[PDB]
């Protein structure tokens, strides 16, 4: 059995974002007055892009994922022409916004984010879920500033762009790209053209600014290994001395 939700059950607030298949609004559940976000998807648009099959597959997975660093999908419902997703509300916004405001993150904030991401990714893997889009724009912040993965070229690993087989190790690479962007302000393989970026990634060609410490370089260099098997395991990330020295939160 399950709960039956309806549009009438929520008081719609301000728009939080405008996506390709619809809008996300802040909402208040009429009964409990609980604050949450309502993602409104349009069927006509989902069909025209034949992503329906994908939406349905992500919703099923997202429903079974319960982790403090993963945005919660509370439920869903639909009507004549729209599909509604009931989501957790992250009051402090996106890491992307924070990154743009600060230009770059200090070691403590970065180490903490990487710790939360590694824990979320470890949980995902334990549930056979892999390849999460953890770009800054897909990362939300909870009431206490805790990270929340919200995913319902600069970050693709060599194996994917080179047209090869990939596994959970792609998430390790992603973590490396993010750690660098957090500390630096921009992803490591940025270039003028897609072609140049692909080449930068394939050859694992990137440089460190002078303010990136030895500990960070060690971790990032290890995560960004061309050969997936050479990349550390998530628990090794969590035990990395740079992480245990700077993370304001335990694993």
Ligand X SMILES: CCCC(=O)Nc1n[nH]c2cc(-c3ccc(O)cc3)ccc12
- Measured distance CA(51)–CA(44) in Å, rounded: 11
- Measured distance CA(131)–CA(129) in Å, rounded: 7
C-beta closer to ligand X: residue 140 or 184: 140
- Measured distance CA(85)–CA(75) in Å, rounded: 6
Q: Is 76 annotated as a binding residue?
A: no
What is the phi/psi pair of residue 35, to 5°?
Answer: -85, 135
Least spacing, CB of residue 86 vs ligand X, in Å = 10
Please report, in angstroms and rounded to a whole number, the separation of the first and last CA atoms in the chain: 35
Single out the catalytic residue among 133, 171, 210, 218: 133
Long-range contacts of 9-13 (CB under 8 A, 24+ apart): 10/36, 10/38, 12/38
Residues forming contacts to ligand X in the complex (CB under 6 A) are 16-17, 19, 24, 37, 39, 87-90, 93, 140, 150, 152
Q: Is 214 annotated as a binding residue?
A: no
Reply yes or no on whether 133 is catalytic: yes
| Residue entry with tokens 């600014």 | 209
Least spacing, CB of residue 122 vs ligand X, in Å = 22
Q: Is 39 annotated as a binding residue?
A: yes
CA angle 174, 179, 185 (to 5 degrees): 110
C-beta closer to ligand X: residue 87 or 111: 87
C-beta closer to ligand X: residue 137 or 236: 137
Helix (H) or strand (E) holding 13: strand 10-18
Least spacing, CB of residue 139 vs ligand X, in Å = 10
Q: Is 2 annotated as a binding residue?
A: no
Least spacing, CB of residue 83 vs ligand X, in Å = 11
C-beta closer to ligand X: residue 152 or 155: 152
Q: Is 20 annotated as a binding residue?
A: yes
Query: Which of the residues are catalytic?
Result: 133
- Which residues are annotated as part of the binding site for ATP? 20, 39, 88-90, 137-138, 151
């Amino acid at each position: 059995m399950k709960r039956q939700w309806a549009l009438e059950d929520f008081e719609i607030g301000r728009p939080l974002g405008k996506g390709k298949f619809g809008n996300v609004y802040l909402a208040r559940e009429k009964q409990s007055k609980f604050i949450l976000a309502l993602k409104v998807l349009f069927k006509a648009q989902l069909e025209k892009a034949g992503v329906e099959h994908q939406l349905r597959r992500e919703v099923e997975i997202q429903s079974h994922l319960r982790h403090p660093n993963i945005l919660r999908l509370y439920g869903y419902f639909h009507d004549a022409t729209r599909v509604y997703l009931i989501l957790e509300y992250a009051p402090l916004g996106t890491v992307y916004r924070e990154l743009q405001k600060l230009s770059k993150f200090d070691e403590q904030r970065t180490a903490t984010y990487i710790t939360e991401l590694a824990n979320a990714l470890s949980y995902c893997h334990s549930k056979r879920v892999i390849h999460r889009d953890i770009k800054p724009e897909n990362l939300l912040l909870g009431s206490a500033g805790e990270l929340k993965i919200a995913d319902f070229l600069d970050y693709l690993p060599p194996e994917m762009i080179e047209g090869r087989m990939h596994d959970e190790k792609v998430d390790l690479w992603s973590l490396g790209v993010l750690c660098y962007e957090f500390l630096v302000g921009k992803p490591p393989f940025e270039a003028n053209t897609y072609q140049e970026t692909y080449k930068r990634i394939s050859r694992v060609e990137f440089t460190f600014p002078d303010f990136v410490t030895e500990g960070a370089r060690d971790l990032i260099s290890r995560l960004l290994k061309h050969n997936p098997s050479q990349r550390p395991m998530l628990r090794e990330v969590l035990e990395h001395p740079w992480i245990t020295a700077n993370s304001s939160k335990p694993s």
